[PDB]
C-alpha cells in the first residue's frame, strides 16, 4: 500500500494513483502512520468495519459504476479542491465525483443501479457538509438538501448540517464518506437533491481466506517464503516461533 492509508487507497487518493492497476494480491501492508491518507478531511463512517472487509478479500476488480461521461449530463463533475493537490495542480479523488450544480441549476437526480455482477459489490460516496451557508448556495444552489440511498436491506436519510469547524487542511468544510455492500441481485438507488459525492469506481469484490492487514516498516525484495510477520518471513519447518504474534499464511 505504500504511503496511503486503506481509507486513502479505497478512495483512490491521488498519492497512490500507481496503486490502481493491481487487482490481485496476497496481503495488505501499512506504514504505521500514513500521512497522505484521506486527502479531503472528514470522518469515514464505520471505518474499522470496512477495514475488516479488506482483511479477507482475495481479489477484486474495479469498474466505472456510473461512467463520468454519460451518467451526469445535466450536472458538472470537474470539481477539484486545492487541499487535495497533486503535483501542484488541484485534483480530486479518482473513485469519487463532485456533482456540483451546472448552468445555474442542480436538478434532482435518481441514478439507480441494478447489480448483476454475480458477486458482492462495494460502493462508496459521501455528503459534503459546507462550513458556511454561502458556500452551500454558491456550490449547490439550495439552502437545504437531502440525500437518500436505498437497497433492499439498507436505507438512510442524509441532511448535511452547516457549521464552521476548525482548520483541518486550511479548508473548513468536511465530508463523511460512507459505504455499503450489495448482494447479487440487489439494486441500489441514489436519490439526492444536493450535497452528493457520487461514486465513480465501485468495487466488485471476491472474498476468501488467507489474507490480512499488517503494519510493517521493512523494505520489499525477492524472498520466497510461506509465513510473513511484520518483522519479516520464516523459511523453516520448526513448529514454534517467538518473532511476533500476528502472522500471515500457514505459520508455526
Amino acid at each position, epitope marked *: 500500500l505504500g504511503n496511503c492509508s486503506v481509507a486513502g487507497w479505497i478512495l483512490g487518493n491521488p498519492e497512490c494513483e500507481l496503486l490502481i492497476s493491481k487487482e490481485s494480491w496476497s496481503y495488505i501492508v501499512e506504514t504505521p502512520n500514513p500521512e497522505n491518507g484521506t486527502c479531503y478531511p472528514g470522518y469515514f463512517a464505520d471505518y474499522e468495519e470496512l477495514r475488516e472487509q479488506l482483511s479477507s478479500v482475495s481479489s477484486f476488480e474495479r469498474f466505472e459504476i456510473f461512467p463520468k461521461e454519460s451518467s451526469w449530463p445535466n450536472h458538472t463533475v470537474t470539481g477539484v*479542491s*486545492a*487541499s487535495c493537490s497533486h503535483n501542484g495542480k488541484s485534483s480530486f479523488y479518482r473513485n469519487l465525483l463532485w456533482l456540483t450544480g451546472k448552468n445555474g441549476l442542480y436538478p434532482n437526480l435518481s441514478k439507480s443501479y441494478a447489480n448483476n455482477k454475480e458477486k458482492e459489490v462495494l460502493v462508496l460516496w459521501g455528503v459534503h457538509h459546507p462550513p458556511n451557508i454561502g458556500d452551500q448556495r454558491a*456550490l449547490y444552489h439550495t439552502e437545504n438538501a437531502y440525500v437518500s440511498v436505498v437497497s433492499s436491506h439498507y436505507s438512510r436519510k442524509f441532511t448535511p448540517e452547516i457549521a464552521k469547524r476548525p482548520k483541518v487542511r486550511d479548508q473548513e468544510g468536511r465530508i463523511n464518506y460512507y459505504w455499503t455492500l450489495l448482494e447479487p441481485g440487489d439494486t441500489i438507488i441514489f436519490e439526492a437533491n444536493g450535497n452528493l459525492i457520487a461514486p465513480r469506481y465501485a468495487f466488485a469484490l471476491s472474498r476468501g481466506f488467507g489474507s490480512g492487514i499488517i503494519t510493517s516498516n521493512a523494505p520489499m525484495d525477492e524472498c520466497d517464503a510461506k509465513c510473513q510477520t511484520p518483522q519479516g518471513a520464516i523459511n523453516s519447518s520448526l513448529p514454534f516461533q517467538n518473532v511476533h504474534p500476528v502472522t500471515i499464511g500457514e505459520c508455526p
Partner: antibody
Amino acid sequence: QVQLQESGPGLVKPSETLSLTCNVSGGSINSYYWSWIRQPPGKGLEWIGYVYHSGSTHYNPSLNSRVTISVDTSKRQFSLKLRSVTAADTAVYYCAREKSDFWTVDSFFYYMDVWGRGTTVTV
Amino acid sequence: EIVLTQSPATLSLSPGERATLSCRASQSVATSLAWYQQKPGQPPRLLIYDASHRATAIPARFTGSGSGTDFTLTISSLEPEDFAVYYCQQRTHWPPALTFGGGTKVEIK
C-alpha cells in the same frame, strides 16, 4: 440569454416611500443572486443589498431597516422597497444579476454581473 | 469595513500608449476583486474578473493582474473608444458585502 429590465420610474417627496420593480426576461429568477445597485450622480457606486433567488435577504448595514426585497412569487420580477426616502439619495438605480462561479472548492472569487439600463429615481 | 482606496484618481495619455490603474484594499482580500468599464452615459459592462481574466470576447487590449492587496490593470494597447471610466469591486463571500472603490477617468493630453 438572460436579459433584464427595471420598472417604476418617477419622483418621490421627502420622507415618502420609494417602490420600483424589476422584471426578468430571457431566463428567470430561479438561480442566481439578484442585486440592487445605486449611484449618486458624479460619484461612485454603493450597494443597497440583495436577496437570494430562493428569497433570503442581505441588506447593506449602513442603510439598515429601510429596505425590503423579494420576488413576486411569479418568479419573473423583483422590486425595491425604500421607506422614508430622504431627498439625499438621488441616483440612477441599477438592477444587476450577480452570479457566483468558481474554480476550486475554495476561491469563489467569481462574482460576475449582468444588469439592465438603470432607473432614474430623481427625488 | 473593507474599503477600496484608489490611485491615481485620474490618468491621461495619448491614445495608443500604456495605461495602468490600481486599487488598494483596507484589508487582505485574497483575489476576489474585479474591475469594470463604463462609457459616458451607458450602463457598465464587466471586463476583468478575479483580477486575472478577460471577459467573454474582449479585445487583446486589456489585462488585469496582481494578487493580495494591491491589484493593477494594464492596457497593452489602447483604442480611442476605450476612453471611459474604470472601477474596482470586492465581494466578501459569506456576508455578501459588495463594496466598490473610487473609479477614475482616462482622458487624453
